[PDB]
């Protein structure tokens, strides 16, 4: 009765993929039937529990991960199918107990001049283990020669920026993603529907 608990879901702006955000949710009345006739979710599939039993279930701890990625890259947000997003930015555990949510923002995240406010990592030393972040601006240097100073010939700046225009194809229009994960613990907190 204290938490609309979707101040995450609908808001002004979100965070980049390499610096995705976490939030605790507690003391809530989770009604998700009004969100079934919401703006159509690009993808809404659950892994550990039933979508026809959500509100009946009264779990203890709940966490929310919100970030923005491109359209073709969205199908990587799942256990396995490791790729650019699924390794260097945000991986999911193979055993996953939660649900994934995504919808399309037509001109919210896209402006005629173009939006260059969302970043993403392309070069990293190793694949990220589940629920890890590495926001380091460490100049990547795969070639033996360690420039380490600035932009180099074989060196590269690991962070790149999304370009989002209102005339793009569907394959890379701004998709807005929210991930719900219920950690498995023997300690109670206050959440139910």
């Amino acid at each position: 009765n204290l938490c609309p608990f979707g101040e995450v879901f609908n808001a002004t702006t979100f965070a980049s993929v390499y610096a995705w955000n976490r939030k605790r949710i507690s003391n809530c009345v989770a009604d998700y039937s009004v969100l079934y006739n919401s703006t159509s979710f690009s993808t809404f599939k659950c892994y550990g529990v039933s979508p026809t039993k959500l509100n009946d279930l009264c779990f203890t701890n709940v966490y929310a991960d919100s970030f923005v990625i491109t359209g073709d890259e969205v199908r990587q947000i799942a256990p396995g199918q490791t790729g650019k997003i699924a390794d260097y930015n945000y991986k999911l555990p193979d055993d996953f107990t939660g649900c994934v949510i995504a919808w399309n923002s037509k001109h919210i995240d896209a402006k005629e001049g173009g939006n260059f406010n969302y970043l993403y990592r392309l070069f990293r030393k190793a694949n990220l283990k589940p629920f890890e972040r590495d926001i380091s601006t460490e100049i990547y240097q795969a070639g033996s020669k360690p420039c380490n100073g600035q932009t180099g010939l074989n060196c590269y700046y690991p962070l790149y920026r999304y370009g989002f225009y209102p005339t793009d194809g569907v394959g890379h229009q701004p998709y807005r993603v929210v991930v719900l994960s219920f950690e498995l613990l023997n300690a109670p907190a206050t959440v139910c529907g």
């Binding site: 392309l122 070069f123 795969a142 070639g143 033996s144 010939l153 074989n154 590269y156 790149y160 370009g163 225009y165 005339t167 793009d168 194809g169 569907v170 394959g171 890379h172």
Partner: protein, 597 residues
């Protein structure tokens, strides 16, 4: 820590950096071509210079990776495209001078006007004035005036510019480890690295000549027939054994004999196949016309057009308030943005070309998941060949009947069939000697085999022998008739058109065999054939990842271009011509001239 891994990361950065830059340049150039203002042209040039500078930086970088040490064929191809020194191997001032004269030639061609001496107030440019004369006029003297005015005015200006263009372009290609600019061009067909599918640069000459030899007899008979029919149209002006006067061929140069159909129609009583009147009388929507092409492409297993296409494409003439470039173009802007720029009118010619351009877009839609430098046709001929097979299927009377613009009667006399095939030949085979000769002359000029003091001499010597066409008035070396064609004065290769004509009939035969078609090939409509659709998509998806020889084999079963598709398409017309010319001269004298002394 391998070179291959270093090269992979370099290529990833290039692809991700270049996609957005190419997209910005494409958006800017679209806003110009659809909305001609000074702000837009400056924005286009700014974006284009940014794109070229990024490309040159990446070229000098990619030149630092030793190609010879690469064992991956795909990454080697992408690296090769980037390592191309291109124009940069020229000094700065010499490159500037080359670009200046290039833009100057383009400008004077697209802006040249000739004025009538009898009435110096009437002046026409190439489009639409001079073209209207060369297409519809039946007066020999007026046509001769048009022909000679265009050449003797703009081409004389082009002559010295073209000499400097030839020498500098050959130098650039030589610095890029080629023999001449034609050899550079011939590099497009070169394959080096795939065992069992390579194809060298001299093999193109061998294949083009070996295949032009087989086309020769069919063209000879069409030439005889058109010559007799034109004798009826211009009495006392044409010898029954000589070459065709260059100014009676239907346009300014003879690239297409399309406008000779009215003078050469086999059976006037049989109706000519035109659906323009049906389109106007039938409820039409310009959206719907393009939608109908879309319905055609989905019926064979291809995807719809994108919502971005329908929202961003320009499908009607914007009017007098908004001036745009109306040359039909299919824009692949990148980032999944596909548009068509066309000032569509409700005419039969625009219907087939709409199919053609939307075929381009499907090609463009295909291979999108490939890396950037592989987003291109297998070679320079594949896109137009694909567009052209679409238009043939749409032009077939069966398709025209099934769409509802034609009467349900479907009368098909052996004479209505010969009419359609004859009109096809005026266009399809009339352009092949023109195409083959232009590139042959250009290749020889680049090789330095034609001295400066005999450019026009060898040009018209070659003109007579191959195409069977003779000049109506003599031209010394002051003139420069070769530079009087758009593709020549605007630095575009021309052999794609020879190659595309053969490829398109190979594809048509293959897809109609896939569709289990039984009748004459020219009556084939691949509509409603998901099997033919899949076989073409199976080729479309490669882009430039596989050699064009391997891609062609994947669909037709042959590693090289073939003439039997064209010859089988035109076999009925061939026998009809052979019968029609029994009492006609076959061959040409290389010595007859219209003029004397």
């Amino acid at each position: 820590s391998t070179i291959e891994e270093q090269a992979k990361t370099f290529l990833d950065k290039f692809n991700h950096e270049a996609e957005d830059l190419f997209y910005q340049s494409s958006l800017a150039s679209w806003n110009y071509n659809t909305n001609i203002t000074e702000e837009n042209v400056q924005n286009m040039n700014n974006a284009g210079d940014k794109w070229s500078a990024f490309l040159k930086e990446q070229s000098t970088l990619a030149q630092m990776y030793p190609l010879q040490e690469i064992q991956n064929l795909t990454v080697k191809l992408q690296l090769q495209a980037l390592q191309q020194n291109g124009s940069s191997v020229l000094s700065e001032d010499k490159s500037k001078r080359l670009n200046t004269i290039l833009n100057t030639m383009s400008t004077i061609y697209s802006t040249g006007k000739v004025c009538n001496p009898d009435n110096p107030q009437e002046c026409l440019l190439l489009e639409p004035g001079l073209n209207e004369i060369m297409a519809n006029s039946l007066d020999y003297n007026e046509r001769l005036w048009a022909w000679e005015s265009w050449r003797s005015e703009v081409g004389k200006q082009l002559r010295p510019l073209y000499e400097e263009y030839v020498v500098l372009k050959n130098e650039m290609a030589r610095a890029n480890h080629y023999e001449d600019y034609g050899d550079y061009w011939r590099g497009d067909y070169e394959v080096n690295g795939v065992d069992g599918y390579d194809y060298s640069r001299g093999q193109l000459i061998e294949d083009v000549e070996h295949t032009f030899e087989e086309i020769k007899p069919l063209y000879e008979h069409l030439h005889a027939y058109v010559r007799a029919k034109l004798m009826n149209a211009y009495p006392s002006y044409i010898s029954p054994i000589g070459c065709l006067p260059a100014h009676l061929l239907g346009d300014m140069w003879g690239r297409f004999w399309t406008n000779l159909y009215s003078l050469t129609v086999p059976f006037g009583q049989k109706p000519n196949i035109d659906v323009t009147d049906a389109m106007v009388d039938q409820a039409w929507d310009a959206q719907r016309i393009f939608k109908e092409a879309e319905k055609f492409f989905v019926s064979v297993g291809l995807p719809n057009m994108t919502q971005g296409f329908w929202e961003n494409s320009m499908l009607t003439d914007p009017g007098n308030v908004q001036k745009a470039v109306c040359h039909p173009t299919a824009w692949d802007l990148g980032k999944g943005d596909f548009r068509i720029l066309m000032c569509t009118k409700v005419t039969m010619d625009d219907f087939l070309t709409a199919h053609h351009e939307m075929g381009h877009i499907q090609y463009d839609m295909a291979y999108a998941a490939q890396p950037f430098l592989l987003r291109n046709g297998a070679n320079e001929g594949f896109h137009e060949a694909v567009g052209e097979i679409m238009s043939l299927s749409a032009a077939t009377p069966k398709h025209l009947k099934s769409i509802g613009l034609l009467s349900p009667d479907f009368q098909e006399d052996n004479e209505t069939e010969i009419n359609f095939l004859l009109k096809q030949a005026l266009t399809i085979v009339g352009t092949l000697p023109f195409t083959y000769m232009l590139e042959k002359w250009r290749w020889m000029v680049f090789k330095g085999e034609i001295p400066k003091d005999q450019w026009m001499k060898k040009w018209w010597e070659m003109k007579r022998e191959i195409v069977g066409v003779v000049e109506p008035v003599p031209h010394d070396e002051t003139y420069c008739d070769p530079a009087s064609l758009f593709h020549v004065s605007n630095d575009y290769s021309f052999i794609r058109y020879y190659t595309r004509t053969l490829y398109q009939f190979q594809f048509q035969e293959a897809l109609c065999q896939a569709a289990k078609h039984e009748g004459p090939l020219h009556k084939c409509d691949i509509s409603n054939s998901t099997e033919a659709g899949q076989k073409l998509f199976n080729m479309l998806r490669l882009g430039k990842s596989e050699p064009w020889t391997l891609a062609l084999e994947n669909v037709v079963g042959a590693k090289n271009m073939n003439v039997r598709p064209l010859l089988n398409y035109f076999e009925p017309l061939f026998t009809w011509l052979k019968d029609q010319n029994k009492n006609s001269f076959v061959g040409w004298s290389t010595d007859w001239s219209p003029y004397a002394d």
